[PDB]
Amino acid sequence: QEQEVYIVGEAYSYGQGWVEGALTTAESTLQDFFGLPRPAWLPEAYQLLPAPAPVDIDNPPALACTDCKKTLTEVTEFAYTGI
Amino acid sequence: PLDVAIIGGGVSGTYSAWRLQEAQGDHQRIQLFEYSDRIGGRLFSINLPGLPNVVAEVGGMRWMPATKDNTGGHVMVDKLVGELKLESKNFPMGSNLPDKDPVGAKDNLFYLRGERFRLRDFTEAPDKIPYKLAWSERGYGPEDLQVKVMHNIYPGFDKLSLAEQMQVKVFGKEIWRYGFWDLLYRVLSNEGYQFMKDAGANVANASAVTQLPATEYSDKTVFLALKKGFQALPLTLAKRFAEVPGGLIAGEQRIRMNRRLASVQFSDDTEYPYRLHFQATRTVDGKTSDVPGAEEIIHARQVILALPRRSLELIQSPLFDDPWLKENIDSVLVQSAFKLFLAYEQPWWRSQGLVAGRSVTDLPIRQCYYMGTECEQDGGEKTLNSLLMASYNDIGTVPFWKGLEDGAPFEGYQPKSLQGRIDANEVVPKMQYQISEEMVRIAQRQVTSLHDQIELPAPYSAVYHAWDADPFGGGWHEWKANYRLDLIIQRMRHPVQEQEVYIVGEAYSYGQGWVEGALTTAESTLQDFFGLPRPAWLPEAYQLLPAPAPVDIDNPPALACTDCKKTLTEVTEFAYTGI
Amino acid sequence: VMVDKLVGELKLESKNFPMGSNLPDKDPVGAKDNLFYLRGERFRLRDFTEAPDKIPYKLAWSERGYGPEDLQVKVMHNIYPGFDKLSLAEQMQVKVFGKEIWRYGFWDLLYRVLSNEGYQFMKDAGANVANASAVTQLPATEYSDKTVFLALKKGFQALPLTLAKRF
Amino acid sequence: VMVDKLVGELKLESKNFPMGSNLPDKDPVGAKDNLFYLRGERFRLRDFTEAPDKIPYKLAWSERGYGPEDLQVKVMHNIYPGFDKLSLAEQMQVKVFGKEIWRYGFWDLLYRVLSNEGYQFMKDAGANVANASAVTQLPATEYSDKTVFLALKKGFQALPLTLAKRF
Ligand SMILES: Cc1cc2nc3c(=O)[nH]c(=O)nc-3n(C[C@H](O)[C@H](O)[C@H](O)COP(=O)(O)OP(=O)(O)OC[C@H]3O[C@@H](n4cnc5c(N)ncnc54)[C@H](O)[C@@H]3O)c2cc1C
């Protein structure tokens, strides 16, 4: 936090093994510690890096299932694919 | 000072009280006595922690809707449930997906003799079935095989009235004189019988007349359940019996829980000839024990014993010395039933292609039902918490599970959904039979084997119930061979002509194993010996109890075949189904 | 998205990166005829579903009839249904067999749910790393040769060169 | 010992109780040709070892090649080697899977060590009771049609009758 060295690239991205990983880390670091706006060509809808879980996830609050009917349907129909 | 004492807070008891109170309550003292602190008898519904909208039906769980013409299906249940404004839901026996051509039960599992196959393989891949069936028994599922067997014995047998079925002779003997297994031994290979038992419904020493009738299998067959659990039906009735306005006895005094009818004695009094001796009981954690002390004594004109066979046997009365009643109380077998529920945090089976209905195995667990996810229910919490039920009734498997009752209780674990809601030590409910850890480990291993998995998620909660001890003796009854069950059905409602004691309930009905049996016996007895009209909600088209055959059916007149062309066509086309 | 739009921005020409056949133009074979040679046996991709008896792995009865990718999808739904559709924050909180998923290595977690022959099959016919976090290896999608990929006509190195050139 | 010596004492005549054939007098067939008819299949006792492919139970690879009795011996040695040779007092102190053996029923203990098809095989081709104490059901001996049994020529009821007669 003290120093003004930044690390970008695929290595410590979410999109490892992709050029997308490298670009997303670079763009986020630029928007966050260099103050550059988001490019015109870059949509706002796109999340560059995944939001983290809380630092303390030991005994976390429950995950409320959003549209479980659709998830369970997808899962069962996938199973039917094999059968 | 009681005009009617009703013994038993099951569905037949509670229905009887409600009817009599709503009809004659203004001038008749009616009281309902129940052995335990719980109303419902063999209807018994619970919600496990984390599953507030997925009911675990430890007793009865579904009924067949009334037909359009109101002549078939469980008409009494369907219309009574309509009358009391209880909400019903579909009881699925398979998958609705894909919404275009629903798989139904076709993908549900079988694991028999070390082989795995799915239901669709009985017709699609009969080489997978590991039973050495006769050439003529291949290509049917177990149910369809039973239909074929029945048409072999007598074509269209299921479509005959009980009176005609009691006159049908096979291999020179009337069918009601055979036990199911003995009759099948004559027409079906040993491997066939083994196949029907294992992949299968039936009892081997029960009357062939009530076991043989079978229908063509169809996962499209519709069943209904109550959203609040089947126990809502008797509870509602009890609730509506103690809330009838008016009457000699005040609403809150009409139901007397925790009273075990110890005995019925005959008093010299002409007005109130029955002296009922009740023992007070207390119920702790679902277990009822006698409270030591005096017997409460009550006087009644009429008595309705809304009680199964074992319960009748535990009541002392000179009434039971009647030769007919002494002979015909033991005219029914009692089938023990056992249920195991396991609650999981996700429906691991949905990823295997399983949605509803049962998978079947020859492992001791026998059958597993997939019973529903909390989040997929109407107004259900946003939780993947799911319920699995296992059930067995077969005598041979019972000893296995019986040995696993001892040991440390299963404690479960507080699932994430319940964190900061329930206590960790309340995750596994306190029940009459407290599931042990060993039983849960072994059930989980057998469930894992059945689904062909290495390891499944562990259950966070469980419930075991046995319908075997007193007073129930078992889960349901079946007519024994060599008994004129058509005559016993009519007489047992009022067993001793002199006395004013009536017997109602599922035990000595035609519809044994169903709430419909209990309701039909109760309603007939009420219409016949209490004079109540038929309810408005109850159609006239529906026959409550089958008309009996003549007492002398030795050398009976011939049965004139009504539209034999249609029967023979049905029978032949059914045969084509297998071929 | 970043690559796609940045490539758009710098006016680099892209092309389809085919993963199979477009012929016959009516019903393209795709990757269905591409070869496998495993354990001395030859079969084609279509045989994972059309002819599963040709697959020379002694798979569990419940793991047959899937290609390697689809088998991984099935495994993931077995562990947690819809896991791939959760956010990273939710995936980091998912516990399996009493431990958070990000505390398992891929191979250790699979060992618990999939037969050894299953794992061997997914490795050989398969993407994955055995000691990598299960949270980033487990997410899988249904296989489809219709999945579209793009390449640069001048090669992917044209993207950094262009950038350097424009810097 | 008590029966044998008491029968000696009362001068009741005993005879061999054969469990198989004595012919041919050179190499007696014994029980090797006696029949089994299980699950629609026919085989003879000798086929448990001579032709195990004829046995129509899907036994584990490690349970094949034994007759039912020998399979029970194998199971018992798996649980505790030499268990049958221990005194009752020692057998009541033997713990398996963290519980004393006399706290298990036979079927529950076998469920842990033997496949379901194994149990089914031992019941069908087999002696045992499924809910009885494992301590008194588990002890088994190697099968041998050469095992000798005796009967009374006048029937076993001659023993109590004689006693009553001599009382
Ligand atoms: C496992 C299982 C599953 C079932 N599933 C279905 C199903 O899916 N569909 C269906 O339609 N039916 C089902 N049934 C059957 C249905 O539950 C019964 O047929 C019906 O509930 C019985 O009603 P009843 O009034 O005859 O008797 P019971 O329910 O037995 O009621 C008798 C009552 O009398 C009480 N009693 C006993 N002795 C005394 C005494 N001395 N004094 C006072 N009270 C006493 C008992 O405690 C009990 O409350 C099932 C049953 C079981 C066991």
Residue numbers in the entry:
A (entry chain A): 512 to 594
B (entry chain A): 13 to 212, 216 to 594
C (entry chain A), D (entry chain A): 87 to 212, 216 to 256
From the paper:
Here, we report the structure of PT-AROD at a resolution of 2.3 Å by cryo-electron microscopy. PT-AROD adopts an octameric structure with D4 symmetry, which is consistent with its molecular weight in solution, estimated by mass photometry. Comparative analysis of this structure with that determined using X-ray crystallography reveals open and closed forms of the lid-like loop at the entrance to the substrate pocket.
